[PDB]
Amino acid sequence: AVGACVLCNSQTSLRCGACIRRPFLCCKCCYDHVISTSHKLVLSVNPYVCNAPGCDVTDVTQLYLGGMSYYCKSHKPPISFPLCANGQVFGLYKVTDFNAIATCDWTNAGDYILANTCTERLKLFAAETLKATEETFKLSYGIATVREVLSDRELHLSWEVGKPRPPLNRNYVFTGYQIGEYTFEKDAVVYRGTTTYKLNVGDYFVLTSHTVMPLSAPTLVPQEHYVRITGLYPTLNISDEFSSNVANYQKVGMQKYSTLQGPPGTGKSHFAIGLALYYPSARIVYTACSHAAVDALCEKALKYLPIDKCSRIIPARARVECFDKFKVNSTLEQYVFCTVNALPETTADIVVFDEISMATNYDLSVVNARLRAKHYVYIGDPAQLPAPRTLLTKGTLEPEYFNSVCRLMKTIGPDMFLGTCRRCPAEIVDTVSALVYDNKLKAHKDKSAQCFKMFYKGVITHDVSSAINRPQIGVVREFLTRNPAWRKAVFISPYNSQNAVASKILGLPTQTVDSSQGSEYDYVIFTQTTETAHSCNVNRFNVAITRAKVGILCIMSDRDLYDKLQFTSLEI
Numbered sequence: 001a002v003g004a005c006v007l008c009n010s011q012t013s014l015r016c017g018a019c020i021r022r023p024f025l026c027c028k029c030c031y032d033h034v035i036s037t038s039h040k041l042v043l044s045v046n047p048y049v050c051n052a053p054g055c056d057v058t059d060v061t062q063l064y065l066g067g068m069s070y071y072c073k074s075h076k077p078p079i080s081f082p083l084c085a086n087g088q089v090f091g092l093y094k095v096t097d098f099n100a101i102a103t104c105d106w107t108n109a110g111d112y113i114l115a116n117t118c119t120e121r122l123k124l125f126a127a128e129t130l131k132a133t134e135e136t137f138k139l140s141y142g143i144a145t146v147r148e149v150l151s152d153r154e155l156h157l158s159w160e161v162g163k164p165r166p167p168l169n170r171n172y173v174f175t176g177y178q179i180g181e182y183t184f185e186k187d188a189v190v191y192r193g194t195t196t197y198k199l200n201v202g203d204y205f206v207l208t209s210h211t212v213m214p215l216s217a218p219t220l221v222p223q224e225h226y227v228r229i230t231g232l233y234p235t236l237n238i239s240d241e242f243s244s245n246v247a248n249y250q251k252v253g254m255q256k257y258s259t260l261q262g263p264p265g266t267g268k269s270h271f272a273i274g275l276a277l278y279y280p281s282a283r284i285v286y287t288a289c290s291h292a293a294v295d296a297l298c299e300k301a302l303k304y305l306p307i308d309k310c311s312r313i314i315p316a317r318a319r320v321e322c323f324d325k326f327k328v329n330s331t332l333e334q335y336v337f338c339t340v341n342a343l344p345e346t347t348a349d350i351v352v353f354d355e356i357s358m359a360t361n362y363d364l365s366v367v368n369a370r371l372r373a374k375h376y377v378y379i380g381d382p383a384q385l386p387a388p389r390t391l392l393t394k395g396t397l398e399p400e401y402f403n404s405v406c407r408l409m410k411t412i413g414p415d416m417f418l419g420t421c422r423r424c425p426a427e428i429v430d431t432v433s434a435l436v437y438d439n440k441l442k443a444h445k446d447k448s449a450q451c452f453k454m455f456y457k458g459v460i461t462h463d464v465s466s467a468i469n470r471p472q473i474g475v476v477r478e479f480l481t482r483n484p485a486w487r488k489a490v491f492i493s494p495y496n497s498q499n500a501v502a503s504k505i506l507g508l509p510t511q512t513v514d515s516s517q518g519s520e521y522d523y524v525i526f527t528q529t530t531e532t533a534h535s536c537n538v539n540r541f542n543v544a545i546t547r548a549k550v551g552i553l554c555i556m557s558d559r560d561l562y563d564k565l566q567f568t569s570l571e572i
């Protein structure tokens with residue numbers, strides 16, 4: 001009932017009752033909030049409501065104090081002070097940006113821009129309000145009842161009438177009834193159970209709606225610069241493999257936190273694991289939002305770090321199969337690999353937060369709350385894909401607004417930059433270097449002469465809103481017959497429905513651009529499918545073409561991105 005103001009920290013008994021997160025607001029800030037917004041309900045020990053029997057006056061601007069009680073203009077006694085006077089709301093211990101965060105629906109890009117350009121306390125308020133709004137929105141979709149079970153991976157579904165149907169992709173995870181977590185892909189629908197269960201008819205699936213806990217810690221702790229490496233002890237015997245990062249490792253020990261921008265295949269995992277070899281006594285917690293990113297760090301650690309000092313932290317409510325080679329849930333091992341939502345309450349000499357473009361400010365703050373560290377290292381690339389913003393429908397979210405770390409990397413620049421791409425053929429490196437890296441990314445490999453582009457719009461059909469381009473898949477099939485080395489290629493597109501069609505017609509393994517992030521393949525076949533803002537996003541385009549080690553075939557819809565591809569053009 002009593003606490004600190006989310007705008008100026010001033011102690012108060014006031015909480016805004018119309019805010020979904022009921023933030024503590026001081027007399028001055030509470031007034032400036034209620035007078036400028038539709039939010040008029042204020043809560044101290046008791047709510048600011050008219051104490052007269054049967055009276056429904058809840059608006060703090062229409063209320064007064066009659067001794068110790070509160071009454072409206074129609075019930076107040078002769079000796080009564082208006083609650084809203086002289087720029088203040090009466091209570092105990094006697095903002096334009098806060099108003100917009102407190103009242104927005106989170107469907108505009110300007111909402112996310114503000115949630116990142118505001119003060120540190122408003123970034124936490126915005127991140128809590130957003131996540132709570134995203135969860136209360138999950139209650140809007142319809143329930144799925146099972147109609148017929150055809151196979152162990154296919155079924156028919158009956159949807160709730162009157163309530164919209166959720167997009168059927170891997171992003172939407174349903175909880176079935178407790179029969180385990182389940183996912184769906186497109187009359188026949190493909191089912192994937194986290195737990196293997198004999199799918200019963202009539203059984204129902206509902207999207208998992210979880211409680212949003214409040215944020216305490218900042219997204220970024222206050223920066224500290226040191227004259228010497230602090231609390232870390234370097235080797236003198238450091239392997240030549242990691243010699244290239246020694247200056248950067250020293251920078252890591254001379255700052256409270258550091259940012260590393262690593263374009264595709266420039267050495268992010270190598271840098272992250274090498275930091276352990278450079279400070280061999282240091283306890284390092286390796287974290288990321290996804291299980292795939294945490295597993296990719298375990299893969300690199302398995303190669304260089306001692307297996308007995310590693311532990312993979314796996315939450316008991318296991319949703320996907322993850323890294324099985326380290327001792328599980330041994331929180332006290334020198335090297336702890338764990339997703340952000342599973343982090344324990346612990347300390348560390350270094351915390352490495354990988355795939356930073358995927359993190360939200362909610363995740364940035366959670367890490368600072370669970371982990372007390374001497375040093376924090378943020379590794380990622382603001383030119384890669386951010387976390388999906390399910391509520392955002394109007395406007396495009398620029399990289400400087402993905403989270404606080406990404407904002408710093410795009411404004412003041414990253415502290416460290418891995419400038420040499422060792423994965424991609426030079427055609428790909430030169431294309432993305434000009435596109436998203438200001439011509440600062442360099443190619444280690446030569447031009448492979450196996451990078452092709454085809455300008456082919458085809459025909460766009462739609463599975464609900466997920467797009468399909470059968471003529472683009474037909475062009476791929478003709479190319480495959482003439483280029484049999486490409487049999488081993490991974491098929492990539494911005495749409496899961498395009499991928500489902502390509503899987504049946506081509507038989508190639510499939511991946512969306514968003515699920516391909518962090519992975520690499522010898523050959524990639526990419527069909528743009530449409531000319532939407534989604535398929536034309538330069539960050540998605542960057543991730544798509546940088547998956548290839550040897551060759552890439554790009555069947556393009558957009559003239560702009562097609563012309564920017566420094567690939568050999570093909571006819572038909």
Ligand SMILES: C[C@H]1CCCN(C(=O)c2cscn2)CC1
Pocket residue numbers: 120220221222223408412
């Ligand atoms: C270079 C100098 C100024 C700009 C970046 N900065 C922050 O924005 C920040 C970190 S934690 C809170 N604020 C602090 C460090």
Ligand SMILES: [Zn+2]
Pocket residue numbers: 005006007008009010025026027028029030
């Ligand atoms: Zn205040």
Ligand SMILES: [Zn+2]
Pocket residue numbers: 016017018019033039102
């Ligand atoms: Zn409010």
Ligand SMILES: [Zn+2]
Pocket residue numbers: 050051052055056057071072073074075
């Ligand atoms: Zn009244």
